[model samples]
Target: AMKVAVLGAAGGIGQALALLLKLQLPAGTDLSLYDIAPVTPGVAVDVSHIPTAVNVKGFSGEDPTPALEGADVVLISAGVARKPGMDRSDLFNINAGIVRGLIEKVAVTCPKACVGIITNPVNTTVAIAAEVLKKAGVYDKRKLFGVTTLDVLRSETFVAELKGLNVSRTSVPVIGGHSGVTILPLLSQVQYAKWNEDEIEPLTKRIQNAGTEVLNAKAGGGSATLSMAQAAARFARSLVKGLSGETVVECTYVEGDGKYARFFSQPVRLGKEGVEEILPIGPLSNFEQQALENMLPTLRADIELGEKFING
Candidate 1:
């Protein structure tokens, strides 16, 4: 039974993610909840009564080191969320230090655990996590991932919504970083739809701006939580299954391929030992080709931001 830790279990994403993980995780798996807020213990107490066999424990304080100790997998949604007019880099500035602090603890107590970073400015924060682990001598480049699963899920959902296809059956691979204008959703990669240049552009734009659309639609209450939680849970399930020796394949942001872009999320075969394989970008059309080229500069800049933070 794997023991997964949720850092920031009191935030909006954290609360939703904790609830989803508690419900989905297998019986006997442990869900350790940690947050800077003083409410995580109450949240865990409330969630633990659900009929699942997953063990639930919560630690609430400024320092979450005690909560993260010995975790098998760490899913981080810990960081400042995007506010109106705020850019991904701005969010990164707030969350980079937050993420690094959590990872510093994870590095010592759960050095071998697979870390999935769902924090913003993913292209860079993911890199920063890697550097932190490296400095701590616990780095496994393949094991540290940027949870861009929500982008992929959103693409599949939107594509399915447009094409009147079964949402569950549709698979869309989203590349590039997770921010405005940087997220690249390749419609050509859709197994069934296979959109052309003209068709791909509109869908790509929608995928990139979907978060903004949701944020606006919320009317200032909050951003996409339900969908984000579902997506995060889906990724968590994939990781758990993969670690259990199941053959699971999915796209996730991680160390680059240098084939498509520096930090592209293509298909990866997961296993007990982390990413068993990082698949190629497969194929692309002329439009997809150009789209891929357009993403590098922004992604590179984001990566450089994380690098700078790590060095700081």
Candidate 2:
């Protein structure tokens, strides 16, 4: 029973994520919800009525300390969502500022909390969070995460769909950043299904651009809120289980060990101390290798842009 905090509980993704956590977290877990919106408390109350044994608390307004307190895991979704025809980078300006503020309070209130960021441009925002924690002298590379499990979720679903398999039982490894070409799904590693070489590029492209698919479907209304929530919830479940003395491994974005970009998404084993292990990304197909190399310039630029945002 871990204490998990969600910093944007009233928004589209936040609300769905909170609902899933309310129903799904292990017994005795404490779920805290916070939002700048005035309706946050109402949202909290709504989720609290669920018949789960977990405790749900809600906080609203500017201060996040109330929600950050006693938290073991803090999931940050507290920023503007994407819209139709908008690139993830288009959100950099607004979300960077919002993430900086919330993470500053998190540094002060719960420095040891495992922070999972779901905010867009996660390729950069995770770096931004790292800088804020560094400035506060609380930076721990192991404890910070960019929630890229949605990419893994999409890859598995798409592959399963293509192969006529059960989506829920499918598993795929998605490594790299959370946007565009930066998202690399290792199709060769997927054990649940097999694909031809001709299927590789198209499948990878679909996983990479899945966010846009949802955005187009919504027609300027919202982004991939529901599926993103489901993905985050699954990641949170694994993290919680790991904290409870189980070894749970999942793909997520974290600071690198010189294997790829400064920050990369790969298989991470979670535990009470956040990332207990960073699993090696195994052999990539020629296509994946080429894709990975081509994306580096953009990914590295995104990382530098984030570092500059905080230090400059």
Candidate 3:
């Protein structure tokens, strides 16, 4: 287990993520909680009751570095969440500012830590993080990531449920960036399940819009808090396992090495130093290939927007 920090401990996603980490994290891991909200201390105290072997600490009332110090992985869910009637792009300016501030601190405090971003407009926030770290002179492409595992989780589960396949054995590789048109769940690779174009088309869209579905179902109460927590926790678990000398693979958004978009989501091998390897997006069907090509223009624009924000 390693030292892990949750940067939005009092929010909906942060609380659930903290609980999951407390219960599921490997033994000997240290869980640190931080938020600007005053309730973070109580949130940490509440999570401490769980009978897990991991240690827990909470820091609130400004100055988040106390929670960040010595962290091996930092998960940032520390921005405004999406509400009903709101598209993820609508969250850009607000969450961008929030992420910029938090990432600046991470650059200073835990420059070597693996940073997992779970904030909204992840496609943009992640690029914002990269720029922030670059400015701080600690930018390591492998050390930063945008958590896009939720899409993969949703894709696998949805396909399994629809096709009556065992959910545990289902694996769907979701590529591209995180958001509406940018999300691409490649169903061509599923071995146990095969579907026609009619079936595949809707499944892809469902995976893409899963977040909005949850947001609207809440009727403005909240967005995908619980599932988002689960995804982030699972990603953090993989990072910890990798850091412990195990090769863990998961889909995440990160800086490119010329094979894809500047910041693209793909399968990555995680190791002690963050992303050890970036695997190719192997073998796309014609439909999937076209889908990816179509998304590039929008995805590239989103990346450019993030880049421009920092350059200005």
My TM-score estimates for the predictions, one after another, are 0.95, 0.98, 0.98
Indicate the TM-score of model 1: 0.95
Per-residue alpha-carbon lDDT of candidate 3 for residues 1-312, written as tens digits (9 for 90 to 100) = 589999998899999999999999998999999999998988889999998899999999768888999999999998888878888889997899889989999999999999999998888888899999999999999999999999988998999999888888888898999999999998998887768758989888899889989988999887899988999999999999999999889988988685568999999999989999989999999999999999998888888888888977
Better of 1 and 2 by lDDT: 2
Instruction: Mark the regions of model 1 whose C-alpha exceeds 4 Å error after superposition.
Output: 194-198, 260-262
Model 2, 1-312: lDDT tens digits are 579999998999999999999989988999999999989889889998889898998999899999888999999998998877789999999999999999999999999989999998999999999999999999999999999989988888888989887887887888889998899999988785667768998988899989998889888898899989999999888888877879989999999685678899899988878899999989998888999899989998888888999998
Error in Å for residue 275 of model 1: 0.9
Clashing pairs in model 2?
Answer: none
- Worst lDDT 10-window in candidate 2: 189-198
Q: List the RMSD of every prediction in angstroms.
A: 1.6, 1.0, 0.9
Model 3 alpha-carbon drift over 4 Å, by segment: none
For each candidate, the alpha-carbon lDDT, in order, equals 0.83, 0.90, 0.91
Displacement of residue 211 (Cα, Å) in model 2 is: 0.4
